[PDB]
Design a protein around this nucleic acid. Structure first.
Ligand SMILES: Nc1ncnc2c1ncn2[C@@H]1O[C@H](COP(=O)(O)OP(=O)(O)OP(=O)(O)O)[C@@H](O)[C@H]1O
Ligand SMILES: Nc1ncnc2c1ncn2[C@@H]1O[C@H](COP(=O)(O)OP(=O)(O)OP(=O)(O)O)[C@@H](O)[C@H]1O
Ligand SMILES: Nc1ncnc2c1ncn2[C@@H]1O[C@H](COP(=O)(O)OP(=O)(O)OP(=O)(O)O)[C@@H](O)[C@H]1O
Ligand SMILES: Nc1ncnc2c1ncn2[C@@H]1O[C@H](COP(=O)(O)OP(=O)(O)OP(=O)(O)O)[C@@H](O)[C@H]1O
Ligand SMILES: Nc1ncnc2c1ncn2[C@H]1C[C@H](O)[C@@H](COP(=O)(O)OP(=O)(O)OP(=O)(O)O)O1
Ligand SMILES: Nc1ncnc2c1ncn2[C@H]1C[C@H](O)[C@@H](COP(=O)(O)OP(=O)(O)OP(=O)(O)O)O1
Ligand SMILES: Nc1ncnc2c1ncn2[C@H]1C[C@H](O)[C@@H](COP(=O)(O)OP(=O)(O)OP(=O)(O)O)O1
Ligand SMILES: Nc1ncnc2c1ncn2[C@H]1C[C@H](O)[C@@H](COP(=O)(O)OP(=O)(O)OP(=O)(O)O)O1
Ligand SMILES: [Zn+2]
Ligand SMILES: [Zn+2]
Ligand SMILES: [Zn+2]
Ligand SMILES: [Zn+2]
Lengths: 147, 147, 147, 147
DNA sequence: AATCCCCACATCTAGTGGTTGGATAGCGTGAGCAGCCCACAAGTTGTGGT
DNA sequence: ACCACAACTTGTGGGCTGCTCACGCTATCCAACCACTAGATGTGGGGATT
C-alpha cells in the first residue's frame, strides 16, 4: 500500500487492532522513507445475490436507476433520488450481512419511496411484485390506504 | 424536377425502389447537364406536432419504445410489439390527416393496449395521463372495469 | 406505394404535376381496390457534407445535442432546444440546396443561440471556431458587445 | 475478522494482492468453521461529499471525465489526462482528510489545468463557476492574465 | 389555390446481374481466480500515554 | 479512544503454477448501390370546375 504522502512502495504495518462490533480490522501503517503514519480500515465487501443465483457488488447506481424509472414525470428531483439511494445503502449495511438478496434491497427501497411519492411507489411495486391483474392494484392501494 | 446543384430545368430517374414499408418510394435521379446524381424520397404527409408545438415526422420506433417500457416483464414478445406498432400506424394513417397532434397518438395506443395486455395498459396511462395520486389509479381501474 | 386506407399494393399514379418554386413533384395516386385518392409529394433529401468529405442526411438530433452540451448548467429548457433545432432546420431548408456544409449549419445555429444564451454562445463558439488562446475570448466578446 | 455468515470469532486469509493503484489491498479470507470464503478490501478513507451532501467515494474516472469534456479538440492526449488525474488524486490524498467536499475537488483541478492547457481552463471554469454572463468571462481572463 | 377529366407517348419501373461494405459467427490470445508454498512480516498480549 | 511501544511467534504475504472466462480478431453472408433494357405506366399537354 504505497504511502499517500510520498508514494513509496511496501509500507509496514504498525498496529492491527480488529474491532468486534463492526467486523473491521483497523491497521495503522507507517512508511520507511517519510516516517509518517496512515490509518487503514478493512471491511467486508457488500454483495447482493440475484434472482438468477450469481452474486454481484452493491451499487447505488442501480438502486437510483430503478427508482428513477418509476418516478418518471413526478416532481422528484435528482437530489432526492441520491438521498434515497444513500438511505437505502445505509439501511442495507445496518444489518451487517456481507451477502444480501435483491428481494431485501427491494423491501428496503419500498420504505423511503412510499414517503417520497405514492404513484411512484405503485409504479415501482407493479414491476417489483410482478402484478398480473387489476385486483393487485387496489389491493396495494388497500395496504397504503390503511396507514 | 430541377437539379438542386445547377438549377437545370429537368432531370431523369436512373433507379426507383419502394424502400420503406409501403410508405415511401426512393429514387436516384441524375441531371443530364451536369452528370451529378441526387437521391429523393416520396411519401405521404404525416407530421406529429409534439407537446411543445415542434412539428416532428412520425416514427414507429418512438411509438413502440413507449410501449416496451410499459410492458416490463410481461409475456409480450417483440412480435406483438411490432404488430401493435403496425396497427397504430395504420390507424393514424387511415384518418387521412397530415398534422396529427401527439396527444392523439396516445389515444391510438390505448385502444389496442387493452387487448395486448391489461396491466401494461394501466402502467402506460400512469405516465401518459400523469396520475397525481392513487385515487386516479382507482378510477381508471373502474372505467376499464365497465368494459 | 401501398394505399393508406386499405394497404393494397401497386397504387396507380393519376396526376404528376411538378411544382417550380419548390423542386417538389406532387403526384396524386389512386388505389385499384378501394377506389380512393392519396396525395404524395417528392422532395430532395437534405444532406450535409462534413469536414471529412463524406455526406450524411441532416438530423435535428445532432444540432440539438451540440447546442445542449454548450448550454450545460444554463437555464435553457428542453423545449427551447427543440424550438431552436426546428428554427435551424427551417433556415437551412430556406436556401433550398440539397447539400449544405456543416460550416453553414454552424453559422445557422449561432444566430438563434446568441439570443438564447450568451455564455452558451461563447462556449459553443470556443469549440466551433477552435479557439487557441484567451485573446479569442475577448475578441468574440468584442463582436457580441458591439450590437 | 468475524465471518459474516456464521459469526465465527476468527477467520484466515487464503490470498492477498495489492489490487488498485497502490491505494487498496484485496484479500480472500476463508472461515475454518464453515469453509465459506469471503473477499475484503482495505484502503484509506476518502469520501467526497457531493453538492447535495450525499457522501460518495472518490473516483478518478469522474475527475477525468469532467476534464476530457473541457479540453474538446485540443491536443491533450489521453496520457496527459491520466497524468492530471494521478496528480489531482495525489494532491487530495496528501492533505490527509477523510471527508473532502466536492467544492474543493474543483480547486484541485484548476491548479494543474493552467499548465495542461489554457483555453480548456476557461471552458472548465464556465460550468464549474456557473458564469451568468460574458462580463465574468472577462474577469477570469483578467485574473489569469495577472499570473 | 386544389382537383379532375382525357390521350398519347417518352420514360420510369422493375427485374437482372455485378461489386462492395459492413455485420457476424468462429477462432486465437489474452485476461482473470485457486491452490499451492514459507518466512518474514504481520497480529497479539502487555504496559502505557493524551 | 486512539495512539504508542514491547517481543514474538503465528500467521499472512508474496511468489509460483495451472485453468477458465472473456474478448480481441477475421473469412463469409446479406444488403445496398450501380449498370442495364423494354414496356406498362407514368407524365405532359389540353380543358374544366370549385
Ligand atoms: N447490484 C445491485 N446493487 C444494488 N441494488 C441492486 C442491484 N441489482 C439490483 N438491485 C436493486 O434491487 C432490486 C432487485 O429487484 P428485482 O426484482 O429487479 O431483482 P433482480 O435480481 O434484479 O432481477 P433480475 O432477475 O432481472 O436480475 C431492484 O430495486 C434493483 O434496482
Ligand atoms: N415523433 C413521434 N412519433 C410518433 N409517436 C410519437 C412521437 N412523439 C411522441 N409520440 C407518442 O405520443 C404519445 C404522447 O406522449 P408524450 O406526452 O410523451 O408525447 P411527446 O411529443 O413526446 O411530448 P413530451 O415532450 O411531453 O414527452 C406517446 O405515446 C409517444 O410515444
Ligand atoms: N448530420 C448532421 N445534421 C445536422 N447538423 C449536423 C450534422 N452533423 C453535424 N451537425 C452540426 O453542424 C455543426 C458542425 O460543426 P463541426 O465543427 O462539428 O463540423 P463537423 O463536420 O461535424 O466536424 P467533424 O470533423 O468532427 O465531423 C455542429 O453544430 C453540429 O452539431
Ligand atoms: N465522486 C466524485 N469523485 C471525484 N470527483 C468528483 C466526484 N463528484 C464530483 N467530482 C468533481 O467535483 C468537481 C465539482 O463539480 P460539481 O459541481 O459537478 O460536483 P458534483 O458533486 O458533481 O455536484 P453537482 O451535483 O452539482 O453536479 C468536478 O470537477 C467533479 O468532477
Ligand atoms: N418501467 C418501469 N417503471 C417503473 N419501475 C420500473 C420499471 N422497470 C423497472 N422498474 C423497477 C422495478 C424493478 O424491481 C427495479 C429494477 O429492475 P430492472 O429494470 O430489471 O433493473 P436491475 O437493477 O434489476 O437490472 P439488472 O437485471 O441488469 O441487474 O426497477
Ligand atoms: N417507464 C414507463 N412506464 C410506463 N409507461 C411509460 C414508461 N415510459 C413511457 N411510458 C408511456 C407513457 C408516455 O406518454 C409514452 C411515451 O413517452 P415518451 O418516452 O415521452 O415518448 P417518446 O419516446 O415517443 O418521445 P420523446 O422521446 O420525444 O419524449 O409511453
Ligand atoms: N464540450 C462542449 N461544450 C460546448 N459545446 C460543445 C462541446 N463539444 C462540442 N460542442 C459544440 C461545438 C461543435 O461544433 C458542436 C458539435 O460537435 P461534436 O461534439 O463534434 O458533434 P458532431 O455533431 O460534430 O458529431 P459527429 O462528428 O459524430 O458527426 O457542438
Ligand atoms: N462540456 C463541458 N465543458 C466544459 N467544462 C465542463 C463540461 N462538462 C463538465 N465540465 C466541467 C465543469 C464541471 O464542474 C466539471 C464536472 O462536472 P460534472 O459532469 O457534473 O461532474 P461529475 O461527472 O464528476 O459528477 P456527476 O456525474 O455526479 O454530476 O467539469
Ligand atoms: Zn511515505
Ligand atoms: Zn444538374
Ligand atoms: Zn386502397
Ligand atoms: Zn464462518
Amino acid at each position: 500500500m504505497h504511502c499517500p504522502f510520498c508514494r513509496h512502495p511496501d509500507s509496514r504495518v504498525v498496529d492491527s487492532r480488529t474491532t468486534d462490533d463492526g467486523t473491521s480490522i483497523r491497521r495503522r501503517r507507517q512508511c520507511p522513507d517519510c516516517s509518517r503514519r496512515f490509518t487503514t480500515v478493512e471491511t467486508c465487501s457488500l454483495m447482493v445475490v440475484k434472482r438468477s443465483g450469481v452474486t454481484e457488488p452493491f451499487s447505488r447506481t442501480k438502486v437510483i436507476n430503478g427508482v428513477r424509472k418509476a418516478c418518471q414525470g413526478r416532481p422528484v428531483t435528482e437530489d432526492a433520488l441520491a438521498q434515497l439511494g444513500q438511505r437505502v445503502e445505509e439501511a442495507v449495511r445496518a444489518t451487517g450481512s456481507a451477502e444480501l438478496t435483491t428481494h431485501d434491497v427491494g423491501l428496503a427501497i419500498l420504505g423511503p419511496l412510499q414517503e417520497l411519492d405514492l404513484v411512484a411507489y405503485l409504479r415501482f411495486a407493479s414491476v417489483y411484485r410482478a402484478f398480473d391483474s387489476l385486483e393487485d392494484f387496489e389491493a396495494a392501494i388497500a395496504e397504503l390506504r390503511e396507514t
